Write a structure and sequence with these properties.
The structure is cut from a larger assembly and holds two copies of chain A (123 residues) and four copies of chain B. Chain A is an alpha+beta fold and 123 residues long. Chain A has helices at residues 23-36, 80-93, and strands at 39-45, 68-70, 98-105, 110-118. Chain A has a single domain, classed as Ribulose 1,5 Bisphosphate Carboxylase/Oxygenase. In chain A, α1 (23-36) packs across α2. Chain B has 16 helices and 15 strands. The chains are: A alpha+beta (123), B alpha/beta (441). Chains B, C, E: Substrate binds at residues 97, 147, 151, 269, 301, 353.
């Protein structure tokens, strides 16, 4: 009967207790996003990829939810393969970063996606 | 029969109720519906106002064919009757005197059309679905919860450890049972301190925001706010209130305290089946949750579905929408007897609860979709390898259900199978599929 | 069937409930009663406590012969389960999860034996019958009340005049209807100022303490206390709360505000027939008033009797005692399924209401006796000569009923007659006996 | 001219204003009314909402015959734009930026249709005429 | 014509106004100016004071040659007329009754000479230019701001991300639009929490103090202070108030709350063109900002200039000085009709806004110089490469404008060219020079 | 279309989003300072050259605004080249430090300048 690790099972929310998605599984996700009408975007964190609270500890205040946007939302993108080119360019620039693909639903005025696209070495 | 008005044209500032009346034999249906409306007024001084402005109009009576001979009488209540922003008042004025009229065998309130001009007098959810996900930074799945068990039974450090094992295993939320307030074995303020400790640890372990629905329910308004105030002192994200035993007056006060302080509110509907279970008498849960979307809560328990099946799953799907959506138009097969325009009142997240463990995952995921909380007691706690293995086990099960849906698979048919695939690559989940299959296939 | 315990000897620190369970066909009665009890717990962590201390024991199951095949299962709940002094908790822990169990068609809570060790954790009535009569200096009859009509309809100066005409005619008390809170036509603070004016006038006219049940019910804890606070500012004697729409949390807060400030509390039970009317599902009004004697109120509406007759008049007489008496021992014909020792918690004065006007006076006077409030809407307001003539008219009728009882006449048979005698010497009452006899003899 | 909407059907949860616009010579009346409405929004992030829900619609333009050549442009403002129970907000959102637009010589706000769903967010007179006379016990004349 | 006083010698404790009166045809100019002054008094009881001490003296009338036949009547108001430290009073007593006099076609207030003895009754800016730069540690350039767009439209997490992208790109300040208070889509307290998060991140990214002008404007005094109080709770540096829709009473209260709590106040002048646009009627913006330097604000919007050109640029330069300087002596070409000695009241920083993007940079930098805030909406947000590229792009443009000025180049002629040089070494700025030149050269 | 770095674009306010000033551009600045009447001074930070708040998080309270003064203000300096000798001596002593040239305007009683004169290796 097993123990689940107290060390090193840092998670990046949706889809992260699954095996890492192959570019095929990542592509199908980016293609879902797109088949619902949602604009994909990439966030990349170089500096600690986990929430924390340094600035203030109030109810529902956390530091670290916001990453830097990698370029803009791919408004009117129809081909998910356009998108994977970006995960892959970002990753050149930032072998450092954790990249995540988020999506915007402008119908509901809200972000609807966030899956970790690239865990930096040994994450 | 001056309250039965076939010719009334409704106003858009009218509370409309749809009462299933089962008259006493011999009450003409007309006289039955007019009787329901007439519990609005009676005369003398009446000549010093025009009672014509403060009366319920039973404008339409329909026949509930075949469910017996019952009738859906439609009463229309003027806006001026209600105190702006008071669910305690809207329930006193409607469900306050009618259900005990001699000329009625059993009457039931099925729905309410709360006009937008009344909607606007309410704060609503202190947050609601969207801000809640923004706050919590969780997108793409239903969120997961663990209910600590036993409810009454353990100490505070024990409740508190259960909490952590569970939350480090990847569930997002843990719940104080509805019966847990402050009690000889576990007094509130220590449950709060240890559940606070436990959730910050679990969150520093995962890297994901975790939180515990601390039950702020108490016996006076003052003590409820006292407990709420101490959650705020810890910086914890969510508190809890059972809104039917505590009250609508009180609920509304916890809900304005949380708006102003940034805490989320998990509302538990304990006691509701006392009012909403019987088909011929009571008030139907969809009314009891329109009352909560207005009084205020961020999560509301909507029960489970995969147990209580299709056809009745349609009225569950009717009030999840009434909860979550900005406008739920008229659909008398899902039990929406009236269109409802929520005029930008935040939605409440459905918490599905009870009977659940993993072959439920795809179905639940499908009935409810993304905007829900799947709350497991035994689905997690009753795992072979304990609490964190159970957490991981409902979680990878859910994420398998997300990925499958996302790569266009049909959870409705591939479900059981999808979970079959997932057992295979997860140790933790596999041992859950076993005890699953101690009653599964 | 580890919750069905035939051998359990009850503790004196046990909450005992008497549930009329109507099982699903095929549930053995034993398994039905054990099911009701089992909604107390479930297992794993359970080995870190002894669940044996925190479980409901269905120690006895009786057969409700002939009312159908239903059973009175007797559950016994440990004291440790409840938060001291919280009716919101006692109702969450008992009526919170059981009534919606699949294996139950309809379950109903008939009675509760609230142990004295739990009784003692409650303030109770801010005053109760005795202090109330001492305060008010009224002895020897049931007190009289006038309900202003229409409820929603008139302005504040109008409500306020109705109030005075009525109270100068010798009634003691006037009521804001349960639906009157603050509303577009009549906002609270002006109703309070004009009803204050009206009662001091009426009292300086008669020489008898008069008072108005000002409805402090609102949508937030804060606003309910805000209104209450302003009654205190006027020096007026009584305020009012509907305890089922506002809540038990809230109720308890208005009730400790009034104890500490010396205001009496008239509790209105609006919404109760939603829970208590059906015979096979709900909670029975005697339970709903034990909850109020504990949460706190000084008057509680008990309904009318002369309308709803003998045999059922016995259960009315069963809960008026449960309200008013220090010890109401076991009497399963008046619906007392358990002895109740109230260990010196103040009694609540029954308010009889509805259908009443004068040939009711001797019967009412006899059902209830001295310790009650006879509350007339139309019995007073619907008098020919208006409000003060209607007040005098119910009043001399009552005092005729007091004198007759006192000089050993039997109100039960001489009643109609006693009132016959009284019509004769009163002008005011005679015109009331006429419209009486527009349906009488 | 995506704010001039001849085809808009008003909602009952709309603040409607009736602006007498006197355009700069050469502004087409249509473009004048659409300009008044357009002081509601501008773009980019705009693709993360639907600006179509938070814009003023100059649904009708009338000609103020003979008082000069001025026009009564009718703007329709969504309920969601206003903070419930705040006249400081309703005035910032309407009279806040429009009256100083270069393409307007002089603009004037003539009337507002304050929808009932918005009316309801306000306390109003602490008393108002009736309670006032009840309080004061004065009936039958104007007061002095 | 006892209010027209050619012989009056002004006191140094006089509020002097300079009214451009356009009389009704036939009012003698003398009688026109005396009429403006006379809205100070009228007689009887008047013999129980000396009205001679409480009257406005139209001591001089000048002819506005050629702008039509209008006149600048100079009224002189005694100090004793005004409540010390009340801009609500100084505006009631001057602009309160005069502008609606039948014998006046249209009257306009052009300037006020607020005596030092009155100046001293005011707190002023809670900080003002200097402390502001000391606090913020920014020296050597105009500061930069980004206005989030769309104003009404996005959620709170969205507003909040816009904010950060923008602030990490090197702008210093971001603004809640004037219309953003708490609204169904984005409620205040979450905008505050996310904009707080966003600015601490952006500041930990750059190493430069960043801040967001949180709009504390609301519908009651109480709610405005409530929001302000929560900015204080975050440790954030600046809050915002629109002072003409909220009010002068209220403005002064936010401004004393910020002095005492160390928050800066960005004042937005929404609604001002309703009063100040027309040449012949209203109150001229320089008066409306003397009222704000006294009521209190740390930044005030002064509009844009490079759009509305030279000659009128002189009156902009007239009130920027009136705002920023300790003494602005008499200069009737920049519209200063009177000398003003501010007796050490802190200066307010001009925010230039609207129409701006980079070839404006040198001109703006020259009109305004160092002590200003250049606020871009589209100049930043409407950049090709988004928000942070736009921030970097206005910023290196500004710093090129600083270096060029500093190494004695003339921004007024080399401007466009200076920006030409800068495009070249910056990628980010170059793509901004392109869309620049989609309408430039 | 480019991304601006989340890592390592730490800024030192005025003049720092420009190329680094050559001793010529630094000299012209120091000569401007001087042609307005403002006394130059040098601040040098050895210990973290960025604001922070450790001591207290109140509105407009930040740690790290104050550096150590390098010697005094060059009251009545007329030759900007005198000044650059100081940036250059300080820099010998503190190859560590970030040096900045500030200026005092005694007419307005306020500091008016602050430009980074020497970023330590790799800043």
């Amino acid at each position: 009967m097993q123990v689940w690790p107290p060390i090193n099972k840092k998670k990046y929310e949706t889809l992260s207790y699954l095996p890492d998605l192959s570019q095929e599984q990542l592509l199908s996700e980016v293609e879902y996003l797109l088949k619902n009408g949602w604009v994909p975007c990439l966030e990349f964190e170089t500096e600690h990829g986990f929430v924390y609270r340094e600035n203030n500890k109030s109810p529902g205040y956390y530091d670290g939810r916001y990453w830097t946007m990698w370029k803009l939302p791919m408004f009117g993108c129809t081909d998910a393969t356009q998108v994977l080119a970006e995960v892959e360019e970002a990753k050149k620039a930032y072998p450092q970063a954790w990249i995540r693909i988020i999506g915007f639903d402008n119908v509901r005025q809200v972000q609807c996606i966030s899956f970790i696209a690239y865990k930096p070495e040994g994450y | 029969l001056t309250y039965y008005t076939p010719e009334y044209q409704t106003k858009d500032t009218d509370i409309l109720a749809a009462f299933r009346v089962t008259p006493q034999p011999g009450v003409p249906p007309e006289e039955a519906g007019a009787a329901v409306a007439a519990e609005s007024s009676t005369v003398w001084t009446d000549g010093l106002t025009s009672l014509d402005r403060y009366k319920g109009r039973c404008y339409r009576i329909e026949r509930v064919v075949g469910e017996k001979d019952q009738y859906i009488a439609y009463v229309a209540y003027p806006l001026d009757l209600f105190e702006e922003g008071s669910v305690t008042n809207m329930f006193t004025s409607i469900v306050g005197n009618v259900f005990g009229f001699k000329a009625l065998r059993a009457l039931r309130l099925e729905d309410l059309r709360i006009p937008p001009a009344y909607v606007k007098t309410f704060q609503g959810p202190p947050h609601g679905i969207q801000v809640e996900r923004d706050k919590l930074n969780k997108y793409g799945r239903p969120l997961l919860g663990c209910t600590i068990k036993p409810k009454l039974g353990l100490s505070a450090k024990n409740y508190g450890r259960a909490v952590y094992e569970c939350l480090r295993g990847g569930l997002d939320f843990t719940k104080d049972d509805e019966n847990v307030n402050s009690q000889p074995f576990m007094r509130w303020r220590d449950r709060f301190l240890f559940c606070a400790e436990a959730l910050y640890k679990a969150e520093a372990e995962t890297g994901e925001i975790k939180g515990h629905y601390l039950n702020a329910t108490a016996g006076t308004c003052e003590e409820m706010i006292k407990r709420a105030v101490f959650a705020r002192e810890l910086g914890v994200p969510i508190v809890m209130h059972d809104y039917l035993t505590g009250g609508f007056t009180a609920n509304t006060s916890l809900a304005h305290y949380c708006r102003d302080n940034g805490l989320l509110l998990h509302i538990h509907r304990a006691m509701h089946a006392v009012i909403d279970r019987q088909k011929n008498h009571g008030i139907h849960f969809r009314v009891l949750a329109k009352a909560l979307r207005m009084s205020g809560g961020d999560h509301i328990h909507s029960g489970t579905v995969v147990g209580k099946l299709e056809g009745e799953r349609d009225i569950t799907l009717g009030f999840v929408d009434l909860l979550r959506d900005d406008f739920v138009e008229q659909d008398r097969s899902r039990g929406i007897y009236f269109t409802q325009d929520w005029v930008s009142l935040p939605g409440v997240l459905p918490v599905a609860s009870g009977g659940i463990h993993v072959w439920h995952m795809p179905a639940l995921t499908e009935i409810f979709g993304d905007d829900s909380v799947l709350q497991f007691g035994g689905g997690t706690l009753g795992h072979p390898w304990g609490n964190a293995p159970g957490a991981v086990a409902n979680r990878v099960a859910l994420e398998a259900c997300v990925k499958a849906r996302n790569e266009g698979r049909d959870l409705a048919q591939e479900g059981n199978e999808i979970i079959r695939e997932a057992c295979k690559w997860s140790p933790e989940l596999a041992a859950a599929c076993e005890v699953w299959k101690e009653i599964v296939f």
